[PDB]
Design a protein around this ligand. Structure first.
Ligand SMILES: *[C@@H]1O[C@H](CO)[C@@H](O[C@@H]2O[C@H](CO)[C@@H](O[C@@H]3O[C@H](CO)[C@@H](O)[C@H](O[C@H]4O[C@H](CO)[C@@H](O)[C@H](O)[C@@H]4O)[C@@H]3O)[C@H](O)[C@H]2NC(C)=O)[C@H](O)[C@H]1NC(C)=O
Ligand SMILES: *[C@@H]1O[C@H](CO)[C@@H](O[C@@H]2O[C@H](CO)[C@@H](O[C@@H]3O[C@H](CO)[C@@H](O)[C@H](O[C@H]4O[C@H](CO)[C@@H](O)[C@H](O)[C@@H]4O)[C@@H]3O)[C@H](O)[C@H]2NC(C)=O)[C@H](O)[C@H]1NC(C)=O
Ligand SMILES: *[C@@H]1O[C@H](CO)[C@@H](O[C@@H]2O[C@H](CO)[C@@H](O[C@@H]3O[C@H](CO)[C@@H](O)[C@H](O)[C@@H]3O)[C@H](O)[C@H]2NC(C)=O)[C@H](O)[C@H]1NC(C)=O
Ligand SMILES: *[C@@H]1O[C@H](CO)[C@@H](O[C@@H]2O[C@H](CO)[C@@H](O[C@@H]3O[C@H](CO)[C@@H](O)[C@H](O)[C@@H]3O)[C@H](O)[C@H]2NC(C)=O)[C@H](O)[C@H]1NC(C)=O
Ligand SMILES: *[C@@H]1O[C@H](CO)[C@@H](O[C@@H]2O[C@H](CO)[C@@H](O)[C@H](O)[C@H]2NC(C)=O)[C@H](O)[C@H]1NC(C)=O
Ligand SMILES: *[C@@H]1O[C@H](CO)[C@@H](O[C@@H]2O[C@H](CO)[C@@H](O)[C@H](O)[C@H]2NC(C)=O)[C@H](O)[C@H]1NC(C)=O
Ligand SMILES: *[C@@H]1O[C@H](CO)[C@@H](O[C@@H]2O[C@H](CO)[C@@H](O)[C@H](O)[C@H]2NC(C)=O)[C@H](O)[C@H]1NC(C)=O
Ligand SMILES: *[C@@H]1O[C@H](CO)[C@@H](O[C@@H]2O[C@H](CO)[C@@H](O)[C@H](O)[C@H]2NC(C)=O)[C@H](O)[C@H]1NC(C)=O
Ligand SMILES: *[C@@H]1O[C@H](CO)[C@@H](O)[C@H](O)[C@H]1NC(C)=O
Ligand SMILES: *[C@@H]1O[C@H](CO)[C@@H](O)[C@H](O)[C@H]1NC(C)=O
Ligand SMILES: *[C@@H]1O[C@H](CO)[C@@H](O)[C@H](O)[C@H]1NC(C)=O
Ligand SMILES: *[C@@H]1O[C@H](CO)[C@@H](O)[C@H](O)[C@H]1NC(C)=O
Ligand SMILES: *[C@@H]1O[C@H](CO)[C@@H](O)[C@H](O)[C@H]1NC(C)=O
Ligand SMILES: *[C@@H]1O[C@H](CO)[C@@H](O)[C@H](O)[C@H]1NC(C)=O
Ligand SMILES: [Ca+2]
Ligand SMILES: [Ca+2]
Ligand SMILES: [Cl-]
Ligand SMILES: [Cl-]
Ligand SMILES: [Zn+2]
Ligand SMILES: [Zn+2]
Ligand SMILES: [Zn+2]
Ligand SMILES: [Zn+2]
Lengths: 696, 696
């Protein structure tokens, strides 16, 4: 039989290992020749593997690179202007790669050039609440100061935006061992910890879904009209640079001014974590000086797009996409994901060569320039937005397959909860101690849902990956899955070697997944989802699961508002319309589910009608006017948090209208806007419900 | 047989006459009790006629009414402040209606209140080019002046916007007999001309597609959050009032200052048409004073929505909509259209009672508050926008069925050109002299296409009617048809009794269509179109017709730009991308047409695929970001003219970037924006073409 079992059994751990090794021998930085070569390789292999067509889709987008003859670094400078201490110009390369060329040195992509000099303020994680505490409680003023912030907790672009609005003239980012060194584990190459010379690369944009900074709304094709740099979207106005903790120790050890306000501000280095401004008395006259000379440059990028044409509904697309560009070798990010996609393509192509075709069309993508702001996925989606919004069934992301070895992690739309529960009950757990048990069983045991019990945790989608344009802009049901760490017994952020030169094939083969069994499990979850989406006669979405979460999010946002009972009285702020809409959604979704069960299964137009109602249900939560000042975040239920792009926020329009509202100087105006956002959300919920009513 | 012939033969002239009489005995002003009664009547009749459901959809929207105890009027006032001449408080009612109550007196809906006093400037039609001529050539300054403008040529809301931007403090609108009195015809009741006491009502908003001024983007439902008046969309900032030509003669006869600049500025009254400012020497010290006391008020309106469920594709909607609210009796506008819709509903319901159902669902609408800014259609579409954009096949408008008795007028999307040609070849001409000939034949003879020869004129859609939200906001293929006058041998605007108390059942029965044969022909064209749209197995749209017009519009906009060859050189302004996209559209559309001819006709999914490509082709021309500063005009090929809402403009984004560009002070910026709009248009054309490519 050509069924999902045939597909799943064809997937091999050993193949994912071979592909990972093949993809991680040299750097594949976006916009470089090596990454164009790899694109051409993947294109040729996907053709050999059996796909119907495989094309490159290219764009010319704004990228950012250090100047190779004028390196970035930071100094402590004395009263005469002598640089008495300099940060590193490069990370010590790992064993056996000390002769690889074209390793890009640590930098913050899209930093402007400058050589600002000043006194340091230490701002903890540079979160919105960190600046509130500094400014409101401690009365420390960052205006004209250089801030130093530890990486972690939130996306770095939000740190830089927050420093910029506090009036900083520069930002230094560093990795504290409190957040990037797990107790009891050795530094790379001897374990998976970040060494003191290790540094995390990453862009510092605030694109809010725009894609290429110069062409928001339209693909950066050959005739594109581009904004000038001054009108570009999302670029920082102050220089920024990342360092490791050896270097950070040298900048922090001399800090004076106020003590840290409490222990949550102290990391693990042997320094006091004084906030400043500036250095203690003996050194009060030394300053910090940044030297940033990176340049932004329009550069060609290349996506690989493979098509496996559907036998029955070729005009319905199920998309498996993940990126290919890496900061250096990409051992985890992204090639552990790319290798899994490569093996999925291979397995599908095997079945195809024996005469099988999925019900619907499956599109496979190897995106470029994800590390520079989700540029490849976003420009392609801008180009193809009409096809995607009328034909797009689902998008499954495929970045890093592992960030730990403890249990499964899934973030997705409620419409996929049932599909994920059912698939994972049919897959074998790779976990020691759960031999012969289902993945569902091990996952639920290690990661219990906060709400349900007997059910696993499934998180809402945030952002910081290539599903953003598909989900929050276009409203196509989206999901992602990977193996992850135990967040309970671990205080550190993501995985320690993230976006460092130390993220290599060896890191993975030696320390994360030597048998490639977690990779294989993730290929089964991702591939199994694409299979069911592209092949099930009825799309495998359960609208009733959205009804349950909409009630949870309505309760949550009402609870937030109710911290202000006096104002809700004064301004007549009612959530009744939103609860009404959620109640109606629940009733209509229950009735639609009954018809879906009971409809005449021989009638394909009835079937195509009800599949279209299922496909367009995520689509119904899109507001074509977007969220306030964020036109490309159009989903009314989910947006990336305005304080942390990686986190999802529910009812974001109401959430941001309420945030910090007790500080607004015109409360009438502020609560007016809360009421406006309640009206928008209740309306959108009711409108989405009505797409599930009988059609006539 | 239940075929289109059965449908068409059931339509009766005598029934349209009975309904017209029934709908025009009392005023049906939006927001009034009489118009709610009529809604309830139509709802009950459409139920009796056989529709599956018929519901009222209500909204609470901003309307505008004079104050019944504080009337609007204009004065000439002397040096002491005595009002020596006053304009009329009402139009003399026609014979036999002198005792009808609740005739609303002439006013400009949405005028602010005020009693401004000042010197007159006469501004001809208050067109953009009229103000250019006054300000640039004649050096006349309107700041702080009251302007008087003749109705005609352009929508009155654009006149008021243009006066406001010239710094006027008030606007007086009047009907000149040059534009509203046809030579050789008598005034009502003895013919169809406008009497000197007749006055044209109408709103003076500049909504640009927003619908209710207080709730742009969302339906004005029970929990809607409303803007405050100061942030409302589209309201005028200066008082405005309309008058007839008896009164206008009294205001114009004393005018001094400059002579009219040429004969195109002179109407037919026995006055000099001096531009002013102010009156001649003897009267130089008299002034004009307006007294406006109308109020804007949120008021309930009611649409009637009837459904005839499709047998095969119930989730595909073909919509026949026209409004029901009138300024007074609505003898032509809108009830000559409403009576035609009523008879169409009756004919469809006859067939339904005998067991027939159309292939697709047909929705019938009786919209409210069209006269106040297309409010009813727009709020309903805002409410139902997700259903309409995923399910909407076509919208056929049904306002006035006649504005003359000479020949057919059709304005529609190119996608309907073939459908209209084919249907009209099968209908009988009602014209004298063409007995036994087709409607196509008489229409083509009397209204030859400028381009084609052997073909009839079909105009692009403009706006000022209820298709605007469906076509220019949502991108649903739209059309309209009516009988019209011979524009060649007639210099007057629209029809003379437009929006006057004299537009009665008698006007129609005595002077326009005593046999109701033009009404019947229009019911056949509108009803025949809805029939073919809702019943043809393949949707009756020809994409190749869009390809032909896109080339015509590209040639036209390039010709405009080429008036500036030096700047096109300096700023490297190329239309090559747009011509490329139009060429590709033509090639892809030709291939798609071949497949549509040759596809396996037994395969319904192939059929539903290709019908979806046809349905979503108009949809592809929507840009979700909208046109500059006009977010609800999202169609890139067609927008209402920025200088005249009634007229359509093609490639509007490029057109407005080029308009008056030689006057812009930063030419680099201006031509940059031209290039931006070329990129947007070429992109949108190519993207729409690609929706017709093979899907995978
Ligand atoms: C959830 O679904 C339910 C439908 O099951 C839906 O109920 C609707 O609620 C609205 C209220 O927002 C009702 O609107 C009323 O309609 C009647 C005419 O049918 C009007 O007369 C009402 O207005 C007048 O009377 C009201 C007193 O009830 C006054 O408060 C008001 O100021 C006016 O005087 C009012 O507009 C509507 O009838 C029902 N529809 C039904 C039951 O079918 C509810 O709206 C849905 N929730 C959301 C968020 O959409
Ligand atoms: C109309 O349809 C046609 C397809 O039949 C489509 O043609 C495409 O045109 C673009 C040009 O805008 C081509 O883009 C080129 O792609 C190649 C790689 O395939 C690149 O190397 C090219 O860039 C380099 O080389 C160019 C020299 O030709 C340089 O001018 C450039 O600066 C770079 O060095 C270039 O990007 C594309 O290949 C074709 N696609 C085809 C033939 O399939 C055309 O774009 C459509 N019109 C619109 C408005 O979309
Ligand atoms: C995940 O798996 C569950 C369990 O198999 C799926 O729910 C089950 O779906 C089936 C198939 O439609 C339901 O069968 C129906 O039962 C009713 C009897 O009341 C009958 O009228 C229908 O003809 C049909 O046989 C079954 O009841 C249902 N089980 C439960 C507990 O809901 C679920 O659909 C799967 N989810 C996805 C996305 O596939
Ligand atoms: C308006 O009417 C015209 C004339 O009837 C329609 O064009 C005609 O459409 C028919 C039916 O599809 C075409 O028939 C095809 O002919 C080819 C032979 O080359 C054959 O391969 C197909 O199987 C089919 O028989 C016919 O050629 C065509 N005539 C012309 C002049 O184009 C037109 O489709 C109607 N428009 C609308 C919107 O209905
Ligand atoms: C990664 O794998 C690819 C495919 O096997 C290798 O590329 C092939 O290299 C062979 C030997 O040089 C050539 O003859 C083939 O034409 C290449 N195939 C393709 C599709 O490019 C590549 O060398 C491997 N890379 C590494 C670093 O191991
Ligand atoms: C930090 O680096 C800077 C720049 O390379 C060093 O300062 C330079 O030293 C060279 C060689 O002595 C001089 O010719 C340059 O004029 C100096 N440039 C600047 C900008 O100061 C500095 O010596 C280094 N400091 C340490 C401790 O290594
Ligand atoms: C317009 O036609 C309608 C329908 O015939 C008339 O309304 C009917 O009036 C009769 C007699 O008064 C009532 O018994 C019916 O119940 C009414 N029907 C409906 C559906 O309302 C109406 O009177 C006519 N109006 C005019 C001005 O002629
Ligand atoms: C135009 O109308 C105005 C307002 O009704 C008239 O002026 C009023 O005349 C009455 C009766 O004599 C006075 O009591 C009011 O004080 C006047 N009001 C104002 C605002 O002036 C005026 O007489 C009318 N002019 C003509 C020619 O009919
Ligand atoms: C990089 O720096 C070098 C020398 O210090 C300079 O000549 C060149 O302008 C810079 N390159 C870029 C791309 O800015
Ligand atoms: C912070 O410092 C800047 C720079 O001198 C000053 O202008 C600004 O007002 C200060 N703000 C506060 C709250 O002290
Ligand atoms: C792999 O799992 C073991 C056993 O729980 C754990 O001690 C180790 O930290 C894991 N490795 C990584 C990289 O997480
Ligand atoms: C209308 O005018 C009368 C009297 O001149 C006044 O009492 C009332 O306020 C006005 N009505 C409205 C609705 O403004
Ligand atoms: C028009 O008149 C106003 C009002 O006094 C004046 O302020 C404005 O500058 C004038 N414009 C021109 C071009 O004369
Ligand atoms: C009706 O047609 C006749 C004959 O052409 C014409 O003289 C008359 O003006 C028409 N009536 C109207 C209202 O257009
Ligand atoms: Ca772009
Ligand atoms: Ca509205
Ligand atoms: Cl992922
Ligand atoms: Cl019309
Ligand atoms: Zn990644
Ligand atoms: Zn990354
Ligand atoms: Zn009308
Ligand atoms: Zn009208």
């Amino acid at each position: 039989k050509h069924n999902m079992k045939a597909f799943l059994d064809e997937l091999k751990a050993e193949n994912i290992k071979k592909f990972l090794y093949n993809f991680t021998q040299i750097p594949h930085l976006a916009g470089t020749e090596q990454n164009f070569q790899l694109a051409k390789q993947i294109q040729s292999q996907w053709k050999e593997f059996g796909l119907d067509s495989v094309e490159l889709a290219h764009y010319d987008v704004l990228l950012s690179y250090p100047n190779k003859t004028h390196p970035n670094y930071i100094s402590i400078i004395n009263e005469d202007g002598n640089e008495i201490f300099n940060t590193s110009l490069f990370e010590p390369p790992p064993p056996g790669y000390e002769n690889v060329s074209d390793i890009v040195p640590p930098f913050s992509a899209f930093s402007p050039q400058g050589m600002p000099e000043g006194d340091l303020v230490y701002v903890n994680y540079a979160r919105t609440e960190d600046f509130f505490k500094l400014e409101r409680d401690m009365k420390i003023n960052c205006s004209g100061k250089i801030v130093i912030a530890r990486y972690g907790k939130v996306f770095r672009g939000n740190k830089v935006k927050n420093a910029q609005l506090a009036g900083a003239k520069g930002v230094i980012l560093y990795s504290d061992p409190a957040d990037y060194f797990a107790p009891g584990v050795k530094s790379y190459p001897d374990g998976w910890n970040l060494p003191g010379g290790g540094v995390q690369r990453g862009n510092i944009l605030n694109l809010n879904g725009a894609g290429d900074p110069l062409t928001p709304g339209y693909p950066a094709n050959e005739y594109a009209y581009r904004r000038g740099i001054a009108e570009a979207v999302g670029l920082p106005s102050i220089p920024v640079h990342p360092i490791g903790y050896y270097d950070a120790q040298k900048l922090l050890e001399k800090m004076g001014g106020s003590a840290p306000p409490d222990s949550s501000w102290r990391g693990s280095l042997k320094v006091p974590y004084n906030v400043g401004p500036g250095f203690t008395g003996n050194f009060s006259t030394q300053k910090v000086k940044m030297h940033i000379h990176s340049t932004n440059e329009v550069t060609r990028i290349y996506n690989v797009i493979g098509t496996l044409r559907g036998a029955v509904e070729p005009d319905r697309y199920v998309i498996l996409g993940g990126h290919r560009d890496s900061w250096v070798f990409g051992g985890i990010d992204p090639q552990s994901g790319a290798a899994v996609v490569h093996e999925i393509v291979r397995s599908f192509g095997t079945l195809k060569k024996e005469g099988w075709r999925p019900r619907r069309t499956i599109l496979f993508a190897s995106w470029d320039a994800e590390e520079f702001g989700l540029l490849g996925s976003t420009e392609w989606a801008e180009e193809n937005s009409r096809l995607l919004q009328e034909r797009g069934v689902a998008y499954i992301n495929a970045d890093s397959s592992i960030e730990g070895n403890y249990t499964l992690r899934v973030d997705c739309t409620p419409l996929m909860y049932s599909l994920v529960h059912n698939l994972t009950k049919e897959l074998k757990s790779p976990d020691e101690g759960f031999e012969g048990k289902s993945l569902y069983e091990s996952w639920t045991k290690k990661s219990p849902s906060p709400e349900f019990s007997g059910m696993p945790r499934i998180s809402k989608l945030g952002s910081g990956n290539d599903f953003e344009v598909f989900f929050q802009r276009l409203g196509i049901a989206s999901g992602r899955a990977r193996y992850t760490k135990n967040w309970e017994t671990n205080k550190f952020s993501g995985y320690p070697l993230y976006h460092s030169v130390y993220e290599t094939y060896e890191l993975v083969e030696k320390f994360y997944d030597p048998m490639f069994k977690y990779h294989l499990t993730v290929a089964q979850v991702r591939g199994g989802m694409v299979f069911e989406l592209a092949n099930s006669i009825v799309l495998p979405f359960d609208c009733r699961d959205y009804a349950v979460v909409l009630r949870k999010y309505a309760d949550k946002i009402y609870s937030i508002s109710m911290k202000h009972p006096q104002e809700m009285k004064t301004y007549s702020v009612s959530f009744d319309s939103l609860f009404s809409a959620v109640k109606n959604f629940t009733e209509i979704a229950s009735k639609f589910s009954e018809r879906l069960q009971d409809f005449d299964k021989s009638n394909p137009i009835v079937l195509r009608m009800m599949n279209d109602q299922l496909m367009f249900l995520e689509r119904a939560f899109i507001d074509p006017l977007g969220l306030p000042d964020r036109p490309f975040y159009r989903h009314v239920i989910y947006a990336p948090s305005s304080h942390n792009k990686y986190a999802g926020e529910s009812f974001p329009g109401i959430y941001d209208a309420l945030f910090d509202i007790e500080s607004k100087v015109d409360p009438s105006k502020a609560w007016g806007e809360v009421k406006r956002q309640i009206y928008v959300a209740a309306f959108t919920v009711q409108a989405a419900a009505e797409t599930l009513s009988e059609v006539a």
